[PDB]
Amino acid sequence: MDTFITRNFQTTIIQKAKNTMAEFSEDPELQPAMLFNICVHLEVCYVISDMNFLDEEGKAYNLRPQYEVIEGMPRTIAWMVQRSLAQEHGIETPKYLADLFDYKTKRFIEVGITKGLADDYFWKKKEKLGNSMELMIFSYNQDYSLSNESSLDEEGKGRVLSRLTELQAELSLKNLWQVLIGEEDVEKGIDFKLGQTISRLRDISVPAGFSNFEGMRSYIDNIDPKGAIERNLARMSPLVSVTPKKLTWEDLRPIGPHIYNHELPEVPYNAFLLMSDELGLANMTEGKSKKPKTLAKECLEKYSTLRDQTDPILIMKSEKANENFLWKLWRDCVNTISNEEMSNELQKTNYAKWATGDGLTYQKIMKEVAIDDETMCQEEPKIPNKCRVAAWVQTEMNLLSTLTSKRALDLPEIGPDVAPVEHVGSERRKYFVNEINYCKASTVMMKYVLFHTSLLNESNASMGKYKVIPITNRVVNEKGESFDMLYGLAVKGQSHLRGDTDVVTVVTFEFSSTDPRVDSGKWPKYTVFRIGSLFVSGREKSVYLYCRVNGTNKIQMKWGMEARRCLLQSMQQMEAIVEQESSIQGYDMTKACFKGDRVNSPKTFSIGTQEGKLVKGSFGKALRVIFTKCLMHYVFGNAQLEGFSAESRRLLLLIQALKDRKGPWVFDLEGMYSGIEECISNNPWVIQSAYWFNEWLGFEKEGSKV
Amino acid sequence: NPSLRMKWAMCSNFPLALTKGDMANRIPLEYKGIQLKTNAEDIGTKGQMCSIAAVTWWNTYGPIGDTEGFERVYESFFLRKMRLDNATWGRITFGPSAEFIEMLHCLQGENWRQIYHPGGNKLTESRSQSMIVACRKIIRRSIVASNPLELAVEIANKTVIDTEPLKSCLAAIDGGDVACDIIRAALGLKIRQRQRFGRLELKRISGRGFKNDEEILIGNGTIQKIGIWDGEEEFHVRCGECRGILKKSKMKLEKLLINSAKKEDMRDLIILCMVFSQDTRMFQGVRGEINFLNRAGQLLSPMYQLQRYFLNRSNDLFDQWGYEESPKASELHGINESMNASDYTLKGVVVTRNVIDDFSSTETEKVSITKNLSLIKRTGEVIMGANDVSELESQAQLMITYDTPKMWEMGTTKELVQNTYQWVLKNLVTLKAQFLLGKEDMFQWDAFEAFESIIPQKMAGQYSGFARAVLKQMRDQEVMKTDQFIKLLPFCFSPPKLRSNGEPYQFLKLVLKGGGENFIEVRKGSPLFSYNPQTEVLTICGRMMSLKGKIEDEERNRSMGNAVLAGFLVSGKYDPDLGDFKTIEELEKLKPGEKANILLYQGKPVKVVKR
Amino acid sequence: MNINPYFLFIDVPIQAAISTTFPYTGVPPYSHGTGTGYTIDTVIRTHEYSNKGKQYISDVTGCTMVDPTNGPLPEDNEPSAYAQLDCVLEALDRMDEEHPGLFQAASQNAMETLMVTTVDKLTQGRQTFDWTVCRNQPAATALNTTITSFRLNDLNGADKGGLIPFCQDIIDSLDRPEMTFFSVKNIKKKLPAKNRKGFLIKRIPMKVKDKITKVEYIKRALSLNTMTAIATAGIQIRGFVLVVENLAKNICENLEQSGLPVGGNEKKAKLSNAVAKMLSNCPPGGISMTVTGDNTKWNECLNPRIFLAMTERITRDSPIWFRDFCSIAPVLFSNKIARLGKGFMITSKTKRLKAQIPCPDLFSIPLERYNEETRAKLKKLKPFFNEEGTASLSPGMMMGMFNMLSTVLGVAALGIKNIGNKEYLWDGLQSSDDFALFVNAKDEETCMEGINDFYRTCKLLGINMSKKKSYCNETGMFEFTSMFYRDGFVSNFAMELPSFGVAGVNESADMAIGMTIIKNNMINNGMGPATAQTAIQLFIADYRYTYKCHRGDSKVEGKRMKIIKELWENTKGRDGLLVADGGPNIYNLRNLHIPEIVLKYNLMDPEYKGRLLHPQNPFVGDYDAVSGTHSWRTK
């Protein structure tokens, strides 16, 4: 393919043909035959035009040639030259792009290569074009057909025929004659007639003021619309304006001022698992992977007083919940985990059926009966409540951003670094894991991901029977000891359907130590028992069980498993921060940002407020806060949080412009604020984001004056 | 869900289709109780199946087919690999050919750029390339250490390229770079005398200069203390394959005559020439921050700061350099900012047709090298230094090996451990003899200095205290076990970090850089350290090596529980009365004189007592 | 001490601090804007911005037609669909004058591409409405069914292979008095199945020869169904939309403003070039302002008639057949019919009954049984309701189908550069309803005047700048297509971070696919070095977990892990083992494009590489992969 093209044609012809083919074909390499045809056509054109010369008055010998080569050049310039020639010489411009233009008769020329014979492709070209331009036809076999007598003479004919004959012989003797394609196959299709229905559709699709499509076409083709825009802008109403105003600091007001109102309810806890109040039953192991049922069995054996408690000491009750059935299901879970059977199925369908409310579902009827029945009305939408700030979100963020004694992250290795960029990445990863390994949020995230993946695996593998999914997690401490942790048990419902969005009920029992009565408004969805006490470092602590009936779907299970990408997201945010810091300089600032060089001191970040005063921290603490923020954004994610995050970005960029003194201008500030505040209804993360935004905005306003 | 479906299929028994034929039938029906292929005859399809275990068995014990011509079929991939290995990596900078598109992921980001010079089939001069690579690596190691000259000489004498000592290549090979010249002067050899400014080579041919201290304002608006040269001077300047003549005066570049050569070489020469000329016109082009540091963590001198900046951001200077019209003489030409032929040439710069005779006339001499790898002639003027060493990095074409622990840090943290343990073993007799004398100086050896570089800093002191306490327990109050002495000796270098109680920190494993599999188990066979009690073999990273003779008869009956925790000695047996196996946290909190229970590994419980 | 995440903005520039705020770019699991309510609201909004224009009844389909083009100019800042034909033509003429040879070159390239294109090209899209089953089907299935039907009605144009004959048959089918086609029908089941009685009831499909008349077929061909983009277009429109979009792309790629089809590090190059060019051209002592803006109701306020006028203007000098071909797509889209989906649901709380009404029977019940919002929606929809469950949607564009032509419109709006020889010049970037406008003038007041003039010109062209989502600031800081810019530094608001799992092809191809995904992400989506390395680590973890091929020196049990440990012990060159064979991972940034077998070839043991690369191995019988024992197939 490319070998013969390179050998038989010069570089300039080959590259020109390649460009011409690439202009309309996006896969030039996949069809070399078109390249062959284009290069042969270009060579023939050059043969016709390269040698034939002219002069000033009439001499067909200066440097003036009688042929202009319009082929082999970009269409953008070829069309310009063609139109310029047509206008200068007072001749009509053909609707197609010509290959050559003759200066002795001032007529565009079409040249084709006919594999079969001349006088047949000639008439096809005539039909395609007509009287617009002349034709010069040459065939691989010795033959020609010209539309003019004063056109190309015999001398050029000999060279072009010899050029074609050499290629024909080479193709014949190199088995590539089967790849040759005629120009008729490329010309295929010029007879497109419009039927009656489509024409009528065209007639009625014209803008206002036109009778049929023909009037619209003629008006477009013949009218000069110069000055129309200014004409229509002159008579446009002044009320149509962007109404711009120069933004100031005073124009920035707190968002969602109803969160401060105390008469509203406070947001409850609604995440799938206890994030910061979780309690895990640690059991040392040698690191060998165990089936989750065995892990739960051993962790329950290590704590016998909790496994063997058979009587509920109820502490709190959800208004609907049926604490007796919840406790009976919990006992069933604990008894099925400890059995000798190799299955985690709850064969006792009674309490699982009666706890998930599966017996209180709606059923379908015929549409005719519903139409007749006047009592049937479409339900009103569930308007989200308007809640206020809850201090437990602040406490949860505070705790999840601290360092624990356990780590749940164990990532594999990668090839050795050889490039400076790879060394930069390795250093950044080293610092990131050093700061995030023992963070509480990291272990919580790994627990979330493991729970969701376990749910999904059990969901579609065995959907028809109630399974119990231990809420487990493997962690390691600074001494290299590998502990198996059990945070609770989660009986998973069963869905009669098999769709991906179908809801499955998952009742979760989670251990804890925090007294639910200290923050009563946090746990309206939970029934809390008291199972026993525990000793950790010589101090006794109570143990509670948080039962809750929840629902989810395969889509949400996959979303929860994918929640692990918060690690990559935090890594990328740290990378962006470090890259921005280094862009001021020319060199990487990872070490200086984290550890601090001789010229650069360690970077301190603003982390929070203590009695209304700013408190600074290290880049490690800020990294932990970033990771916690990403984790909570993923955990508390819904449409409201999505919209709030998307919309508050514009306000944040406006504050950035104000800080940089870039003189921002706003066209609808109240519209911006309304768009931001329409998403603050009941999401704990959105409400806390609004509270934090207002506090930070107050700090920024105070700082701007100085 | 292709991922989850694949997960389930791999959890199936026999998910993989298998062909029919003698080669297919060579797989056993079941291997060591694992069924590998289906022994079922399908009704109509007759399709046999197999497990992934079948694939693993084929790769483990399957027929060894011919693998000739494989590199011919996949020649493009191997060409890509060769280009990647033969490439040279420059510097990564942040802020604002088909062989370059391949590496695009590693070359261009959104805020960073990676300088990358691809290689391939440049094999003939391997000796010189390897000598340059080795000299650059030696210089890089030496700069970060106190008294760089001493370490440079001590590493240069113990390094060999292929088979010849580095000194032999330096003396024999006439080529090289700033690093090779620095090493030559360090070893006492002779080098060609040329003034250096980065890659720029300068040979004064006329004029005189008297550097004076002055305060200069740069474009960004900061005052810098720079030594400025006053007086008209001329130099013969070379950069790679491009040479020229430079006339300059106080804060001004007057003439710059050069020849035609590689575009990047021309650009580098011209930029270096402007920077050296100390023109105020290039002082004012500094609109950014000049705070670059060397790998030693020091601050570059102002001239090298400007050199680095204007080598990185060349347009910031060509914009603030002005332009002029070059004469229309045949030999005299003009070059624009893009190193092209254009009469709109830079102010004072002109490319010329006539050949400038190379200044590199044989000038071997004996320069004096200072502590900081700075070369000074008898007259007393610095000619070259560490700052001028190129920052390019590549892989030597000939195996270069350094026989010194100071060069172990260039390992993969697996070769470092291998070398440290082999060094400990080869000196086991003397090490043990010195330990059994009440002397602790062996912890300061250079091998342990190299080892410390892979122990995380946060836990280096704790590990050192733990290991030292365990060794002292093994020695004074008891007789030792050789294996654990070997295992825990490297960790003893760092100063102890005993807790407030005065006792050391107990550990179950000792972790190193690049974890996952790089850890040392204090009481078990880690992947980086294993030992067979009976066969007397130490498998360090799969390099089984015998221990005959060095072991003692009496240290075979002794249990392993006597040297697994500091301050704990074995007593009694596995008594299921105190409770379950205690965690290190409980052992640390245990009152003196109390017993406990321990699980050395799977099936070896033991009981210990505090002292 | 109470932690405040937003305090990070006190010490870090915000552009970097909100980097990759969303770790995904797909539709989340909770934000699903689909249903008959949303379709009805879209129809109401579309007809609300064009109700002041001409209204008439289609001669062919009989639907209600609203024509906002050449209508009264808007008198308020509400969305306006009354584009002026003269203003559009003037903008196109100015664009042609500034770019001579562009319209005709693009038209000729599109014509040639159409002539060489084949009918098989209409299979690489997405779900397509199928008139034969009135349901969304994959493009290939819809094309095949349409071809069989056309063969039934004596329409043989797909056999010839070319696209033009197929489009000719498409437009000739509309003239057939009655169209016969194959329909799939489901019937209940009575065959045995062992659950507790050896009997079960299910559904089985059958093919039948069904027939429809000309009007119904025309309505079906013009109909677009709701998805579960919120609309899909049949196969009668793809053939022409392909060529029209190709022509628009040809024009767009030659325009400095068109901010398509850029992707990756050349997008930052485009942003930086625009900022630098506008900063350089600022008058000495003047001011440059950039308007990072958004367009409201972009699809609803754009009219198909304006795009028909555009295809007419651009193809002025092209052959008549090509002009007729290019006029079909906006013509077919000007008479489009919107399908409203499944319907609503009415429930009885006292009786505990529920039912779903069909769209054709929306009004069969009184509007007092629907809630307030649906009641008002149905009241407003009634005028445009067809008695088949569909609504007429003549104005508007209904989501991305002419993104390239719309970008051409936006660029033409950006090419005016001035109104009334006023002391300001404007340019910008356009990305199909995402735009950035830079205005140069001597003072901020004249910059605001120029921005107002641009707003009014866009109003004249049918483009509605969002005042609630647009804002202006000094040049050097703006956002374009979710890409932030500040003092040269460039960030991204969202990134599609790699999913978790494997491609599911095989351990040979899956490794290459994962490495290629990471590579393409760090090239295009701007993933950094550390993030790319961590993505490699996570993919290696997923790979080992999925294929049960952990390191041979680890401690993990399994059928395959036993043999993996045996191979680890036997092998001497353990650095040459593939990850699938329990070997280590040697992938990093520099070598993400080299197949791992090629990477390890020089380290493999001769026996190991002979067994792995065995030509007659019984297992074998984009991404760059090396054939081996790991390139196995699954039934």
mmCIF file of all heavy atoms in Angstrom, chain C residues 26-45:
data_model
loop_
_atom_site.group_PDB
_atom_site.id
_atom_site.type_symbol
_atom_site.label_atom_id
_atom_site.label_comp_id
_atom_site.label_asym_id
_atom_site.label_seq_id
_atom_site.Cartn_x
_atom_site.Cartn_y
_atom_site.Cartn_z
ATOM 1 N N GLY C 26 -21.383 11.478 35.196
ATOM 2 C CA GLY C 26 -22.629 10.878 34.779
ATOM 3 C C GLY C 26 -23.793 11.318 35.643
ATOM 4 O O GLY C 26 -23.651 12.066 36.610
ATOM 5 N N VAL C 27 -24.976 10.835 35.277
ATOM 6 C CA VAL C 27 -26.200 11.173 35.999
ATOM 7 C C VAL C 27 -26.183 10.446 37.338
ATOM 8 O O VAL C 27 -26.081 9.211 37.365
ATOM 9 C CB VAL C 27 -27.448 10.809 35.178
ATOM 10 C CG1 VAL C 27 -28.658 10.622 36.087
ATOM 11 C CG2 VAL C 27 -27.722 11.879 34.134
ATOM 12 N N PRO C 28 -26.277 11.149 38.465
ATOM 13 C CA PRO C 28 -26.263 10.469 39.765
ATOM 14 C C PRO C 28 -27.443 9.526 39.903
ATOM 15 O O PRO C 28 -28.311 9.463 39.020
ATOM 16 C CB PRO C 28 -26.352 11.623 40.775
ATOM 17 C CG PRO C 28 -25.908 12.814 40.042
ATOM 18 C CD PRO C 28 -26.280 12.613 38.615
ATOM 19 N N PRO C 29 -27.508 8.768 41.002
ATOM 20 C CA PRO C 29 -28.615 7.824 41.187
ATOM 21 C C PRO C 29 -29.883 8.460 41.726
ATOM 22 O O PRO C 29 -30.935 7.808 41.716
ATOM 23 C CB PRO C 29 -28.033 6.831 42.193
ATOM 24 C CG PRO C 29 -27.175 7.684 43.059
ATOM 25 C CD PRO C 29 -26.598 8.762 42.160
ATOM 26 N N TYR C 30 -29.817 9.709 42.189
ATOM 27 C CA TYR C 30 -30.948 10.376 42.812
ATOM 28 C C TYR C 30 -31.485 11.545 42.003
ATOM 29 O O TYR C 30 -32.639 11.933 42.205
ATOM 30 C CB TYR C 30 -30.558 10.889 44.207
ATOM 31 C CG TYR C 30 -29.135 11.394 44.289
ATOM 32 C CD1 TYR C 30 -28.775 12.602 43.711
ATOM 33 C CD2 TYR C 30 -28.152 10.657 44.933
ATOM 34 C CE1 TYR C 30 -27.476 13.065 43.777
ATOM 35 C CE2 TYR C 30 -26.851 11.113 45.006
ATOM 36 C CZ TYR C 30 -26.519 12.317 44.426
ATOM 37 O OH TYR C 30 -25.225 12.777 44.495
ATOM 38 N N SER C 31 -30.683 12.111 41.102
ATOM 39 C CA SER C 31 -31.104 13.242 40.278
ATOM 40 C C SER C 31 -31.495 12.708 38.902
ATOM 41 O O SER C 31 -30.717 12.723 37.949
ATOM 42 C CB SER C 31 -29.995 14.285 40.194
ATOM 43 O OG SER C 31 -30.454 15.468 39.565
ATOM 44 N N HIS C 32 -32.730 12.224 38.810
ATOM 45 C CA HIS C 32 -33.288 11.687 37.571
ATOM 46 C C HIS C 32 -34.471 12.564 37.169
ATOM 47 O O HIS C 32 -35.574 12.418 37.701
ATOM 48 C CB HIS C 32 -33.710 10.231 37.748
ATOM 49 C CG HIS C 32 -32.569 9.262 37.700
ATOM 50 N ND1 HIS C 32 -31.902 8.954 36.535
ATOM 51 C CD2 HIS C 32 -31.978 8.531 38.676
ATOM 52 C CE1 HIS C 32 -30.948 8.076 36.793
ATOM 53 N NE2 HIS C 32 -30.974 7.803 38.085
ATOM 54 N N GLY C 33 -34.234 13.473 36.227
ATOM 55 C CA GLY C 33 -35.281 14.346 35.736
ATOM 56 C C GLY C 33 -36.021 13.746 34.560
ATOM 57 O O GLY C 33 -35.883 14.212 33.425
ATOM 58 N N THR C 34 -36.808 12.704 34.819
ATOM 59 C CA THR C 34 -37.536 11.998 33.777
ATOM 60 C C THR C 34 -38.963 11.751 34.241
ATOM 61 O O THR C 34 -39.240 11.681 35.441
ATOM 62 C CB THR C 34 -36.855 10.667 33.424
ATOM 63 O OG1 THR C 34 -35.498 10.910 33.031
ATOM 64 C CG2 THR C 34 -37.586 9.965 32.289
ATOM 65 N N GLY C 35 -39.868 11.620 33.274
ATOM 66 C CA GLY C 35 -41.264 11.365 33.563
ATOM 67 C C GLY C 35 -42.189 12.196 32.700
ATOM 68 O O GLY C 35 -41.744 13.128 32.024
ATOM 69 N N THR C 36 -43.481 11.869 32.712
ATOM 70 C CA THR C 36 -44.434 12.639 31.921
ATOM 71 C C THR C 36 -44.563 14.065 32.436
ATOM 72 O O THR C 36 -44.815 14.985 31.650
ATOM 73 C CB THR C 36 -45.798 11.951 31.921
ATOM 74 O OG1 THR C 36 -45.680 10.651 31.330
ATOM 75 C CG2 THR C 36 -46.810 12.768 31.134
ATOM 76 N N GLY C 37 -44.395 14.272 33.741
ATOM 77 C CA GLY C 37 -44.466 15.622 34.274
ATOM 78 C C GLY C 37 -43.397 16.529 33.698
ATOM 79 O O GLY C 37 -43.673 17.670 33.320
ATOM 80 N N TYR C 38 -42.162 16.030 33.608
ATOM 81 C CA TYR C 38 -41.076 16.845 33.075
ATOM 82 C C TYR C 38 -41.251 17.105 31.584
ATOM 83 O O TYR C 38 -40.979 18.212 31.110
ATOM 84 C CB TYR C 38 -39.734 16.176 33.356
ATOM 85 C CG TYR C 38 -39.225 16.432 34.755
ATOM 86 C CD1 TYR C 38 -39.731 15.726 35.838
ATOM 87 C CD2 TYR C 38 -38.247 17.387 34.992
ATOM 88 C CE1 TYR C 38 -39.271 15.961 37.120
ATOM 89 C CE2 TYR C 38 -37.781 17.628 36.269
ATOM 90 C CZ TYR C 38 -38.296 16.913 37.329
ATOM 91 O OH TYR C 38 -37.834 17.152 38.603
ATOM 92 N N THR C 39 -41.702 16.103 30.827
ATOM 93 C CA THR C 39 -41.963 16.320 29.408
ATOM 94 C C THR C 39 -43.059 17.359 29.209
ATOM 95 O O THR C 39 -42.948 18.243 28.349
ATOM 96 C CB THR C 39 -42.354 15.002 28.741
ATOM 97 O OG1 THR C 39 -41.339 14.020 28.984
ATOM 98 C CG2 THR C 39 -42.532 15.184 27.242
ATOM 99 N N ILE C 40 -44.127 17.269 30.002
ATOM 100 C CA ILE C 40 -45.222 18.223 29.891
ATOM 101 C C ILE C 40 -44.734 19.623 30.236
ATOM 102 O O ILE C 40 -45.069 20.600 29.554
ATOM 103 C CB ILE C 40 -46.384 17.778 30.797
ATOM 104 C CG1 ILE C 40 -47.139 16.616 30.133
ATOM 105 C CG2 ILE C 40 -47.304 18.961 31.087
ATOM 106 C CD1 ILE C 40 -48.530 16.326 30.685
ATOM 107 N N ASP C 41 -43.935 19.744 31.299
ATOM 108 C CA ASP C 41 -43.393 21.045 31.675
ATOM 109 C C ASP C 41 -42.488 21.600 30.584
ATOM 110 O O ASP C 41 -42.490 22.807 30.320
ATOM 111 C CB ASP C 41 -42.631 20.931 32.992
ATOM 112 C CG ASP C 41 -42.180 22.275 33.521
ATOM 113 O OD1 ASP C 41 -42.831 23.291 33.197
ATOM 114 O OD2 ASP C 41 -41.172 22.319 34.256
ATOM 115 N N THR C 42 -41.689 20.738 29.952
ATOM 116 C CA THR C 42 -40.842 21.186 28.854
ATOM 117 C C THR C 42 -41.681 21.716 27.701
ATOM 118 O O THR C 42 -41.354 22.751 27.111
ATOM 119 C CB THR C 42 -39.948 20.042 28.377
ATOM 120 O OG1 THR C 42 -39.081 19.632 29.441
ATOM 121 C CG2 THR C 42 -39.112 20.473 27.179
ATOM 122 N N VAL C 43 -42.769 21.020 27.364
ATOM 123 C CA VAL C 43 -43.636 21.490 26.285
ATOM 124 C C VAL C 43 -44.251 22.838 26.646
ATOM 125 O O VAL C 43 -44.310 23.757 25.816
ATOM 126 C CB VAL C 43 -44.714 20.438 25.970
ATOM 127 C CG1 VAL C 43 -45.762 21.008 25.032
ATOM 128 C CG2 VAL C 43 -44.078 19.199 25.364
ATOM 129 N N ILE C 44 -44.719 22.980 27.888
ATOM 130 C CA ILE C 44 -45.331 24.238 28.309
ATOM 131 C C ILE C 44 -44.317 25.371 28.241
ATOM 132 O O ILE C 44 -44.618 26.464 27.750
ATOM 133 C CB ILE C 44 -45.929 24.104 29.723
ATOM 134 C CG1 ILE C 44 -47.049 23.054 29.768
ATOM 135 C CG2 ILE C 44 -46.453 25.450 30.210
ATOM 136 C CD1 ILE C 44 -47.882 22.944 28.506
ATOM 137 N N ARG C 45 -43.101 25.134 28.737
ATOM 138 C CA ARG C 45 -42.072 26.166 28.688
ATOM 139 C C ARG C 45 -41.727 26.527 27.250
ATOM 140 O O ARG C 45 -41.569 27.707 26.917
ATOM 141 C CB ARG C 45 -40.823 25.695 29.431
ATOM 142 C CG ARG C 45 -40.824 26.007 30.916
ATOM 143 C CD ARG C 45 -39.424 25.910 31.497
ATOM 144 N NE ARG C 45 -38.690 24.769 30.961
ATOM 145 C CZ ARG C 45 -38.710 23.549 31.479
ATOM 146 N NH1 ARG C 45 -39.415 23.264 32.562
ATOM 147 N NH2 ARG C 45 -38.005 22.585 30.893
#
